[PDB]
Design an enzyme around this catalytic site. Structure first.
Site, mmCIF file in Angstrom:
data_model
loop_
_atom_site.group_PDB
_atom_site.id
_atom_site.type_symbol
_atom_site.label_atom_id
_atom_site.label_comp_id
_atom_site.label_asym_id
_atom_site.label_seq_id
_atom_site.Cartn_x
_atom_site.Cartn_y
_atom_site.Cartn_z
ATOM 1 N N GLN A 79 69.974 43.169 27.219
ATOM 2 C CA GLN A 79 71.258 43.702 26.879
ATOM 3 C C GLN A 79 72.128 42.701 26.146
ATOM 4 O OE1 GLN A 79 72.121 44.875 31.253
ATOM 5 N NE2 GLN A 79 73.410 46.342 30.137
ATOM 6 N N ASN A 106 74.632 46.870 43.730
ATOM 7 C CA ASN A 106 75.398 47.396 42.638
ATOM 8 C C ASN A 106 76.011 48.733 43.042
ATOM 9 O OD1 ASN A 106 74.132 45.191 41.621
ATOM 10 N ND2 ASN A 106 72.756 46.354 40.273
ATOM 11 N N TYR A 117 81.695 47.409 29.362
ATOM 12 C CA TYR A 117 81.959 47.131 30.785
ATOM 13 C C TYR A 117 82.649 45.818 31.040
ATOM 14 C CZ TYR A 117 79.044 50.807 32.890
ATOM 15 O OH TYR A 117 78.519 51.986 33.377
ATOM 16 N N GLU A 135 67.844 46.884 40.588
ATOM 17 C CA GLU A 135 67.912 48.312 40.547
ATOM 18 C C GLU A 135 66.542 48.953 40.333
ATOM 19 O OE1 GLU A 135 70.748 50.065 37.902
ATOM 20 O OE2 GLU A 135 72.453 49.106 38.963
ATOM 21 N N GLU A 180 74.288 48.984 26.508
ATOM 22 C CA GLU A 180 74.293 49.852 27.681
ATOM 23 C C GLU A 180 73.191 50.940 27.670
ATOM 24 O OE1 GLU A 180 75.307 49.136 30.339
ATOM 25 O OE2 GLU A 180 74.756 51.143 31.144
ATOM 26 N N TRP A 181 71.948 50.481 27.549
ATOM 27 C CA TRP A 181 70.713 51.265 27.642
ATOM 28 C C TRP A 181 70.721 52.566 26.820
ATOM 29 C CZ3 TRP A 181 67.789 47.499 29.361
ATOM 30 C CH2 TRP A 181 68.290 46.599 30.331
ATOM 31 N N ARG A 195 75.177 35.420 36.620
ATOM 32 C CA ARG A 195 73.881 36.006 36.799
ATOM 33 C C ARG A 195 73.266 36.442 35.455
ATOM 34 N NH1 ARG A 195 72.252 37.982 41.630
ATOM 35 N NH2 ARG A 195 71.118 39.666 40.505
ATOM 36 N N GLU A 241 76.939 43.476 41.442
ATOM 37 C CA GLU A 241 77.391 44.190 40.264
ATOM 38 C C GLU A 241 78.499 45.178 40.668
ATOM 39 O OE1 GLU A 241 74.125 46.303 38.047
ATOM 40 O OE2 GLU A 241 74.199 44.517 36.774
ATOM 41 N N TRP A 295 80.415 43.036 36.795
ATOM 42 C CA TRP A 295 79.598 43.461 35.674
ATOM 43 C C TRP A 295 80.504 44.151 34.672
ATOM 44 C CZ3 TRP A 295 74.750 42.424 34.306
ATOM 45 C CH2 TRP A 295 74.200 43.158 33.230
ATOM 46 N N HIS A 321 64.543 42.663 34.872
ATOM 47 C CA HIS A 321 65.606 43.564 34.601
ATOM 48 C C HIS A 321 65.111 44.627 33.619
ATOM 49 C CE1 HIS A 321 69.751 44.879 34.485
ATOM 50 N NE2 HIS A 321 70.121 43.842 35.219
ATOM 51 N N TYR A 346 78.981 51.566 41.900
ATOM 52 C CA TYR A 346 79.884 51.983 40.827
ATOM 53 C C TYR A 346 80.853 53.084 41.196
ATOM 54 C CZ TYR A 346 77.771 48.664 37.702
ATOM 55 O OH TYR A 346 77.326 47.472 37.157
HETATM 56 O O1 LIG Z 1 76.098 50.257 33.534
HETATM 57 C C1 LIG Z 1 74.949 50.299 34.331
HETATM 58 C C2 LIG Z 1 74.656 48.865 34.743
HETATM 59 C C3 LIG Z 1 73.797 48.211 33.676
HETATM 60 O O2 LIG Z 1 74.665 47.663 32.646
HETATM 61 C C4 LIG Z 1 73.001 47.154 34.456
HETATM 62 O O3 LIG Z 1 71.788 46.910 33.782
HETATM 63 C C5 LIG Z 1 72.620 47.877 35.725
HETATM 64 O O4 LIG Z 1 72.477 46.920 36.788
HETATM 65 C C6 LIG Z 1 73.796 48.843 36.018
HETATM 66 N N1 LIG Z 1 73.334 50.197 36.360
HETATM 67 C C7 LIG Z 1 74.424 51.005 36.950
HETATM 68 C C8 LIG Z 1 74.103 52.352 36.925
HETATM 69 C C9 LIG Z 1 72.850 52.747 37.407
HETATM 70 C C10 LIG Z 1 72.520 54.090 37.381
HETATM 71 C C11 LIG Z 1 73.422 55.040 36.876
HETATM 72 BR BR1 LIG Z 1 72.888 56.882 36.859
HETATM 73 C C12 LIG Z 1 74.672 54.645 36.386
HETATM 74 C C13 LIG Z 1 75.014 53.287 36.418
#
Ligand SMILES: OC[C@@H]1[C@@H](O)[C@H](O)[C@@H](O)[C@@H]1NCc1ccc(Br)cc1
Length: 468
Positions: free
Chosen positions: A21, A307, A440, A171, A431-432, A79, A375, A424, A125, A309
């Site tokens: 990332q 982590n 973020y 994760e 962001e994948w 990290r 996170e 984070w 990761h 959220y």
């Molecule tokens: O924003 C998701 C963050 C990525 O930036 C990091 O790679 C990861 O640790 C984290 N995953 C959080 C997340 C994971 C699953 C879902 Br559905 C929504 C958010």
């Protein structure tokens, strides 16, 4: 109303990024492709905006600067993730050790330590060498366990005389669910018109990841821990699950939702078996551990990173797939009332108190000796079309983190042993499957020029870290 002194002397404050990332330079310094290079290159339509990690935000060439910016903020630890495939282009040892990659990480580590910052390294990761993904299916095979071990051993040997904090997986739930159930993340298997079987594969992967994890932990315990005096653990992720009503069915639904997402991992790591409620429902589609695997999984971590959220309400629900196997409908709304303010996605809801309950749940349910919030953070629309002046006045993100830390403190006060909070992400990054449509970080990055300017939240955290 929350400050630095409200926390133990012991506690650590920091932020993170992760290899794919942030580093970019995907094809420089002899790095070998990851499944995520491949995913974004061959399937650009699966990325909200077609983008990729080719450059990402270019840390590989800018590390010296980033480490300045870390220290300007006061970061106590940072990290980061080692691109498996940058140190070992072809994944196995036979393909060779890339010395250029090995130098980068050493340069990077020494720079961190030269600056007072504690390095903290995730082994995986999600950026698996394509060479392994291709040879034997990646995490669909048992073959992944030893190769992962050999990678692990290499890293400990090469870098560990200076690393105190090793995380094997980040994760695995997300990696396995999005990757082999929704086909949304690399390798893109399982979802409609995709390739795997959303009923089988996520179980096989998690099953192998836990065995990978096991392999790596022992390698470290028996071989490096006494020498290098560090700690190895795993990083899990979860939403908090709130009962919609306060009837029974909704309490069982929370127990199941947590079992399936958290317990999927913590349970083996505790009693050496998957949660009862997963055996009930998944049956013979869930793999068994050998006598010896169960035993050696029990308490097979030095710490649990988490982590968090958001939180959601749960309730009983009404094609086979992991997705629908816990039998729980999830909703953000009680009586149209959202559980917390809804952020840009539609998905993140600001719920400070969910981290409180989640952390309490884990101590109480899985008896974890050492916990870190690895996170914590909030999403923000990447609004092109506004001046940087405006974009960086992220008042809300400051507020997000306060309320969160305040819930952490309350978890410590009411018994739970959390030792760290890690924002984070330090930097705005890739962001994948959403690529660059959001942000973020506490440090703005201009996705084109890679220029870095601190947001207000960064300047807040600089003060906060420095209070007592
Ligand atoms: O924003 C998701 C963050 C990525 O930036 C990091 O790679 C990861 O640790 C984290 N995953 C959080 C997340 C994971 C699953 C879902 Br559905 C929504 C958010």
């Amino acid at each position: 109303v929350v400050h630095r002194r409200d926390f133990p002397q012991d506690f650590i404050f920091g932020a993170g990024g992760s290899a794919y990332q942030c580093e970019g330079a995907y094809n420089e310094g002899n790095r070998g492709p990851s499944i995520w290079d491949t995913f974004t290159q061959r399937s650009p339509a699966k990325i909200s905006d077609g983008s990729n990690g080719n450059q990402a935000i270019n840390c590989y060439h800018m590390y010296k600067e980033d480490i300045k910016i870390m220290k300007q903020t006061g970061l106590e630890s940072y990290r980061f993730s080692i691109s498996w495939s940058r140190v070992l282009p072809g994944g196995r040892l036979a393909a060779g050790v890339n010395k250029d990659g090995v130098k980068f990480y050493h340069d990077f580590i020494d720079e961190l330590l030269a600056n007072g910052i504690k390095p903290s390294v995730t082994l995986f990761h999600w950026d698996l060498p394509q060479a392994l993904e291709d040879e034997y299916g990646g995490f669909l095979s048992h073959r992944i366990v030893d190769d992962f071990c050999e990678y692990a051993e290499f890293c400990f040997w090469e870098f560990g005389d200076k690393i105190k904090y090793w995380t094997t997986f980040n994760e695995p739930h997300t990696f396995a669910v999005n990757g082999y159930a929704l086909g949304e993340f690399a390798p893109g298997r399982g979802g409609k018109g995709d390739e795997g079987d959303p009923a089988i594969e996520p179980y096989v992967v998690t099953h192998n990841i836990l065995l990978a994890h096991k392999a790596a932990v022992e390698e470290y315990r028996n071989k490096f821990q006494k020498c290098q005096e560090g700690e190895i653990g795993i990083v899990l992720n979860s939403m908090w699950m709130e009962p919609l009503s306060d009837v029974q069915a909704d309490i069982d639904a929370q127990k199941r939702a947590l079992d399936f997402m958290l317990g999927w991992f913590l349970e083996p790591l505790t009693t050496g078996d998957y949660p009862k409620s997963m055996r009930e429902l998944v049956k013979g589609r869930l793999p068994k551990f050998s006598a010896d695997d169960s035993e050696k999984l029990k308490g097979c971590y030095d710490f649990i990173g988490m982590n968090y959220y958001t939180a959601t309400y749960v309730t009983n629900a009404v094609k086979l797939s992991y997705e629908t196997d816990d039998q729980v409908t999830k909703t953000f709304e009680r009586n149209q009332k959202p559980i917390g303010h809804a952020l840009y996605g539609g998905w993140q809801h600001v719920v400070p108190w969910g981290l409180y309950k989640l952390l309490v749940y884990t101590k109480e349910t899985y008896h974890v000796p050492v916990l870190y919030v690895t996170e914590s953070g909030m999403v923000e629309e990447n609004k092109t079309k506004i001046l940087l002046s405006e974009a960086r006045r992220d008042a809300e993100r400051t507020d997000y983190h306060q309320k969160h830390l305040a819930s952490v403190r309350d978890a410590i006060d009411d018994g739970v042993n959390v030792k760290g909070y890690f924002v984070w992400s330090f930097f705005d990054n890739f962001e994948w499957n959403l690529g660059y449509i959001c942000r973020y970080g506490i440090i703005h990055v201009d996705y084109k020029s890679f220029e870095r300017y601190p947001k207000e939240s960064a300047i807040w955290y600089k003060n906060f870290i420095a209070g007592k």
